Every structure is written in C-alpha cells, then in structure tokens.
Backbone:
C-alpha cells in the first residue's frame, strides 16, 4: 504494498532522523520552576556545541506585580548570598529562587560528554568557600552520562533529561552539549573546520515565562515536540 | 607630477583598501523599519565571521510613550503568533512588527557564502509547522549570492545589500558573514588558527533607535560611511 | 618534620598553583569608577581566551533615583557624542561617564598577547574621525605587555592590572586575554582542538553595582581574592 502507507512511513522517518544531519540542531530547554508553580524556560540550539549559559540574575523569578524587575534589583538580592551583609535585606529571597531545574536535551548529542555545571551566584565554581584561585570549568561531576533519564521522543530515539532540586540559594548555569561523532569522523579535522566554526553560536535564544506548568506543557512542550515529565511522572 | 595630488591619491587608496587587511572588520548593519516610519538599527562587526543574531523580542518596536518595554511584555505578545491562544490579546501586534528589513554588508566578504536566515518567532527554522525535529542552520535559500544588490562604497568596491518585506508576523534573524579567502589561503590552517579564534566575537554590538529614516541617514549612514537606499531608490 | 606544617604547605601550594591547570579559568575584573565615587564591576572568565566585551551603554552609570535606566535612554545620551546634534541634550552627560577604568587580570595569562582596546561610542576603532572603512581589531597599542602593573596575588605570582583615565567621552571596550602556552605546546593543534572550542565562552558573566569603592573592596575584592589598588596606592 500500500503506497499510501509507504508514503506515511517515509514521512515519519524523515522527521525522526532529521536531527542526525550535518547542520541539524541539537536542542536544549532548561526549565526553572518556582515555589508558586510559575515556570521560566530558556531555549538554546546548535549543531555542533550548545553553550547554555545563564546568569544568576536571569534565573530569578523576575516579575513583580505584572512588571519585569531590573538586573540591578535582582543582583542586589543575590549579593547577600555571595558576600555576607552586602545588601540591606532583612529576609531571604527564597520566593524568587527556583525550587527545581529540569534540563531537556533532544538530538544527536554526545551523551558521554554533555556537561551540566551548577555554579555559584557570581559565576564561580561552586564550593563551600568560592574563590578566584579555585575556579575552573567542566568538573568531573558535571558529566552526567548514564544519570540522564530517557524520555519518549516519538520516533527519534533522542531525548533525555536531568533534574536537580536546589537548596534556597541562587545559582548560575553552564551547559555544554557537544555533537555525537562516534561514527568515527572528526568534524574539526581538515578543511571542514572553518565551516564548523562559522556555525557556532548562530541560533537566537528564547526565554519564556509561564504562570503554571500546564501552560508550559500546552504552549511550549506540545507545540514544538519536546516531551516533559511532571511531578507525578506523567509525560506531556 | 603634482605631489599634493599624489598625496591625495595615496590617502584615498589607504582608506578604500583598508578593509582588505588582516584583522580589518567586515561590517553589518541591519535596519528594521516599522509602519509609522521609525527605524531600529543593529551593528555587528568582525574580521573573520560576523555572527548577527537577533531575538524576535529584540526586533519589535519596543518604545511605548517614551519608555522602553521589557522583554517580558514583548515576548508575551510574540507568544500568540507562536502558539495559538497562548496570551490574552484580542487584537494583533502588527504596529510593532517590522514592515521591512534591510541588510547592509560592507567589506572583504565572501559573497558566495554569506547567509541570511529569517527564522521563526522562537528561533526555529521557519516553515508552516515549526517543530524541534526539523530545526537546522544555513538552509540552501539563505545564501543570497547574486541576489545581493550592489551599492556605492565611495571607492571601496565593497558594499552590497539585501531587502525583504515581512508579512505581519514576528521573526528572528541569523546572519553569518564569512571573510573572503578566494586568494587561495586558508586562515584556519596551521598555527594562525589560534589567532583567528582569539579574534572571533570580540567587537561590541550597537543598537540605535530613530523616529524616522532621515535621522538614520543623517546621524548613522552619512556619519560613518554606510550607503543606504530609500523607497525611491535614492542613495544616502 | 612537622606534618601539620607540611599539610599547611601542601594546602597553600594547591591553592596557589591551581590556575595553571588545564580547564582552570583566567579571571578578568573591569572596574569603572564615576565622579561621585560609585563603581560598576564586570567579571569574565575562561581557560583559553577571555573575551571581555562591553557596550558603551553598559559602561554608563545607569541608576537614576534608585531605578535602572533603559538601554534606549542611555544610547540616546551617547548618540550626541557620536554624531553632532543627534539628540536633544542641552548639557553634557559627564555625570554618568567613568572617570577611570581599572582592569584586573589574574591567572595563567599570556602577558605578551593580552590586549585592551578602548573603542568608540558605537564600537568602532577609536580615532579623531571614526568611519566604517577604518575599523579593525587588535591595534598595536592595545598590547600592554610590560605596561601592566604587578600586584600581590598572595602566593599565585599571577595578578597584574592596567589603569586608564577617560576624558569625558563615552567609550566601549574589547579585552582579549589568551592563555599562556610558553611551555611549548599548542593546545589548538591536533585532536585537543575540539575540546578547547567546546570550552570557549561557557562561563556566566557578572555585573555588580557599588555606591563606593570600600563596598567594592569589602564585598567583591576581599570576598574572592582579587587584590585591588586605590587612589593612595594602598592594596585591598
Ligand atoms: N511516564 C514515564 N515516566 C518516565 N519515563 C518514561 C515514561 N514514559 C516513557 N518513559 C521512558 O521513555 C523511554 C522511551 O519510551 P518509548 O520507546 O515508549 O517512546 P517513543 O515514543 O518510542 O520515543 P523514542 O523514539 O525516543 O524511543 C523509555 O525508556 C521509557 O521508559
Ligand atoms: N541610486 C541607486 N540605486 C540603485 N543602485 C545604485 C544607485 N546608485 C548607484 N547604484 C549602484 O551602485 C554600484 C556602485 O556604483 P558606483 O561605481 O557609481 O559607486 P562608487 O562610489 O564608485 O562605489 P564603489 O567603489 O563601491 O564602486 C553600481 O552597481 C550602481 O549601479
Ligand atoms: N601597595 C602597593 N602598591 C603598588 N604595588 C604593590 C603594592 N604592594 C605590592 N605591590 C607589588 O606587587 C608585587 C607582588 O608583591 P609581593 O611579592 O609582596 O606579593 P605576594 O603576596 O607574594 O603576591 P605574588 O604571589 O603575586 O608575588 C610586587 O611587584 C610589589 O611591588
Ligand atoms: Mg521508542
Ligand atoms: Mg565604483
Ligand atoms: Mg610575591
């Protein structure tokens, strides 16, 4: 045989396999969820290396009575966590700090080398005592490998996620997602290199705000085909 | 031959040929024009690869009664074009969407490989049904080659432009402008590579707002030497 | 041996030498000081190439009666310095332009090649008559080499600084800080290249505002271990 079914099947496979192509994007969606259930999503994409870099001021829930707060006000609040008695706050800012972070990765990702680094409030490597002397990238713990959680990608065989609960303190984020080259070919070798470098960092980012998770599911996840997992382990 | 004239000629040539030098910038000016005639300009530069990346929230006319609107408010408006009934708008946002985009390129550009990609409202490859599975960079159509329009560069032999009319829907932009290496030398080959990589992405961007095109012509184009074309095909 | 002292010594050396490691960050802190003594600090870090890029609108003191000014308002003020009579200002904006810029560099820096380029108000190479034709990066004068000033790093042997007085005109900034490879090994050569490229531009930036220098010293410099020099040549 039936060629209407053969045509459906070819159509399916073309969609399912497309992300494996040269110059096809890997996709990263980071979702921050806050205590009253609001969500902020950050989308990054690239074919070669996704660099998902988020400042601590960017990860705060930044809406106050319908208006967006400035980086100045947000950083002022963050400062008191970084340096003792460096602002004038008499109470904490936990209302605006994420309770949970979800990382959704979809595409031809090198799962051995994808790294998620949760860094300090001013961008330093996280530790008890943050200091410029002991500041580095890609610590051993940031490589999640088989600690990624598999999720349905509806034929693509290519979505996983990672989840983390925060502890009431602002953080910043550095995610590095390299392309799978386990087919034995180094795309950085030879004259192709220039074409790869030209393609790095060329896709616009997008930040979205949602008052609750169901809005996120209805108008992001299911609009574009990223499967997401809720607190009841039900997929959307 | 007369050495006052010889000196003038050397002076002319030094200015005209300067952009061909190693570490000389290529120049990109993107101009958005809106329905009441206001203009927003975005300037990018690099010697090796210009990466002109603009979010859809950045391309909206964002001035409201003398004050700049927040990304939150702008994205809220954009959302309704991306996902059906995802905001509370009862009317469209066409007042703030560009009618026209102009791309001005000046310098030692590889015109075979310069690419202009008009992408969807959340940064995905543009198509009838946008979806994460079918998201890529540098589609075949983005390479304009002889569809660039030549304009005077006053001796430089090195300015072209590209124009597009939008259709009432928000878009995002990815422009990739590589350097002309048709003199036979690969600047990415050998020990020079590190010096090239150090130079990528090192020039500050600049965004400017104008209430009308003549302001743009008087205080940008003719101030710095980018020739621009108006709706009467007259140059400025 | 006395092994309590041997343990102290090993602990010291581990902290002092850490920045020499592969994937350890170089650190850059730029401090702008304004006429009433307020300070803005900008922090950048990377192990391979720090790219410290600051727009002129970002370098303005942008607080007005407790609220942060928009890029639109700030750029409007800057415009009049770039293009004659392009805004409606009847007085200058010198209250909000830095009097002084300090550049603090800490780590395994190639001091032969670190470059600090003070560029024009719209990002062009600085000169009497700024023009797109004569726009380039890494001019010979931007390499400071032995014009860097040595400062204590408390055992690291690895901090220097550079200072400049401005002249009442807005500027933009491009700082390029490459890693020291004088141990004879090219980290861009061979299969390591891909791992280097993956690490570029992956550390979150941080901007902070202080009403006076002592706040900067107490809650940034001495919090994280960057030594700073005041107008009395006393270190903090
Ligand atoms: N509700 C759930 N909670 C947690 N994990 C789930 C859930 N549903 C499915 N998964 C996991 O997702 C993975 C992929 O599932 P499945 O093969 O059914 O999806 P699919 O639509 O074929 O997608 P793919 O092409 O990605 O395989 C499996 O490991 C499965 O256990
Ligand atoms: N008013 C116009 N509308 C459209 N195209 C124009 C207009 N004026 C000039 N051009 C085109 O610009 C190109 C360059 O023109 P011309 O040689 O006169 O400029 P020039 O000052 O010598 O600059 P260059 O050094 O870039 O050649 C030509 O293809 C010309 O047709
Ligand atoms: N108050 C000051 N003003 C200007 N320069 C200073 C001042 N104090 C120290 N320096 C300079 O800093 C440099 C390093 O000093 P010193 O060796 O005492 O510091 P250290 O704590 O051992 O740090 P390092 O490990 O970086 O050497 C010297 O060149 C010194 O002259
Ligand atoms: Mg399956
Ligand atoms: Mg000509
Ligand atoms: Mg010493």
Residues:
């Amino acid at each position: 045989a039936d060629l209407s079914l053969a045509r459906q099947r070819l159509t399916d496979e073309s969609v399912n396999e497309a992300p494996r192509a040269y110059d096809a994007n890997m996709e990263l969606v980071i979702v921050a969820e806050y205590p009253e259930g609001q969500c902020k999503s950050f989308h990054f994409a690239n074919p070669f290396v996704i660099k998902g870099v988020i400042k601590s001021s960017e990860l705060m829930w930044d809406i106050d009575n319908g208006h967006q707060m400035s980086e100045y006000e947000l950083q002022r609040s963050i400062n008191g966590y970084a340096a003792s008695h460096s602002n004038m706050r008499q109470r904490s800012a936990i209302n605006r700090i994420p309770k949970k972070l979800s990382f959704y990765l979809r595409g031809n990702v090198d799962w051995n080398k994808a790294s998620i680094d949760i860094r300090g409030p001013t961008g330093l490597s996280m530790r008890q005592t943050e200091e410029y002397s002991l500041d580095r990238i890609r610590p051993p713990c940031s490589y999640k490998r088989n600690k990624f959680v598999d999720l349905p990608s509806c034929g693509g065989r290519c979505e996983k996620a990672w989840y983390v609960e925060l502890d009431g303190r602002p953080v910043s984020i550095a995610v590095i997602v390299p392309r799978n080259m386990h087919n034995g070919i180094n795309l950085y070798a030879g004259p192709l290199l220039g074409n790869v470098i030209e393609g790095l960092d060329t896709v616009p980012e997008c930040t979205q705000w949602f008052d609750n998770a169901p809005e996120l599911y209805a108008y992001h996840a299911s609009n574009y085909g990223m499967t997401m997992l809720d607190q009841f382990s039900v997929i959307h």
Summary: Residues 1-236 of chain C form one domain. The pocket of adenosine-5'-triphosphate (ligand 1) is lined by residues A 150-157, 159, 229, 233-235 (CB under 6 Å).
